[PDB]
């Protein structure tokens, strides 16, 4: 039962990868996103990833091909690496500016209060920062 | 009497380890590189390796620390690495096998450059690198 | 009461962790090397201030008697943070062993495990801030 909010989330996800917004994700854009989260896939590995879901033989990911990538590679059940990515100064917490820096690096423009609202939504213990438990919760 | 070519070789070597190119080698990058050559060092073993040469107490390898690592651990084991290179196990390393090893190591080389590497290391002129030629190549 | 030769030897070993060329004096450069091996990045002026405080005769370096005088004297949450490298709030066996190796006292896993177990109060296998302060 597809609904509009689901599609909006899919499109936000796709925008996180399609940096120039030209409708397809290239190997460069995919590799950039994977680098921003602490990984170094090679040109050949990225071409392999895209080739497994490419349907029109152009070496780039369009929207349905991206949804298929999600279906194939995402699973319910590595996390500490992502937390460390967000946790810039290594104090065990993700501050508002650290979240803002990650968001910005992903091409997302959020105002100060918007980042604070994200933090507040995910901040259970109310200390003003995101720890590992809260990060895992907001990621699943 | 350090020379420009030697510094270029030191930096090529360091680039083989500093995958993200941020100036220092982490335990993650060192472990990835060592796994690419058929070894499974543990987190603690990698931390120990870096600790024996660490001069600024951050658990990562910078350039002088990397040169010191070379001076300490290089000596005047090879069969495992050769087997790693020899993908199809026929006792020879072809151009595509060498090219894949190069790619996996984050090295971007054109086709003719790989052929020139073969030409340099292929003594008996058969167009592939056997074990003797592989060992001799890892000295010059 | 006179010191034993083993006492003097241990004092000289601790001094030699700073006086690394073994010429009997600790310069600002050598103290900086130590502090950097610990992860800190003190400026030359901070190092000079440390020296000045400890250099009672004013010749610009620390010698063995001045070092001993400092030893007779004993926040420290920064010293703890220096040992706790991953910042999880505890000092692990690997962390203590690595710190000591960088300082110049290479210890074995066995020795460090035993040493931490002897200083371990709550018995969780790691030295927390309170145990660190209590030992100090
Ligand atoms: Ca694009
Ligand atoms: Ca496509
Ligand atoms: Ca943080
Ligand atoms: Ca929180
Ligand atoms: Ca690096
Ligand atoms: Ca280092
Ligand atoms: Ca082969
Ligand atoms: Ca040959
Ligand atoms: Ca000295
Ligand atoms: Ca003096
Ligand atoms: Ca720790
Ligand atoms: Ca304890």
Author numbering:
A (entry chain B): 3 to 79, 84 to 146
B (entry chain A): 3 to 78, 84 to 147
C (entry chain C): 2 to 75, 84 to 145
Copied sentences from the primary study:
Calmodulin (CaM) is a Ca2+ sensor protein found in all eukaryotic cells that regulates a large number of target proteins in a Ca2+ concentration-dependent manner. The protein consists of two homologous domains (also called the N-terminal and C-terminal lobes), containing two Ca2+-binding EF-hand structures each, connected by a flexible central linker. One of the several proteins that induce helical conversion in melittin upon complex formation is CaM, which binds melittin in the presence of Ca2+ with a Kd in the low nanomolar range (∼3–60 nM) and forms a complex with 1:1 stoichiometry.
The relative orientation of the two lobes can be characterized with the virtual dihedral angle defined by the four Ca2+ ions because the inner structure of the two Ca2+-binding lobes and thus the position of the 2 to 2 Ca2+ ions within them remain identical in different complexes. This dihedral angle is very similar in the pfCaM/A and hCaM complexes (118.0° and 117.5°, respectively), while it differs significantly for pfCaM/C, where it is 125.5°. In the pfCaM/A complex, two residues form contacts with each hydrophobic pocket; Ile2 and Leu6 interact with the N-terminal hydrophobic pocket, while Leu13 and Leu16 forms hydrophobic contacts with the C-terminal hydrophobic pocket. In contrast, in the pfCaM/C complex, Leu6 and Leu16 could be identified as N-terminal and C-terminal anchoring residues, respectively. It contacts the exterior of the C-terminal hydrophobic pocket in pfCaM/C, while it is more solvent accessible for binding mode pfCaM/A and in the hCaM–melittin complex. Multiple potential anchoring residues were found in the crystal structure of the pfCaM–melittin complex, while only one arrangement of anchoring side chains could be observed in hCaM–melittin crystals.
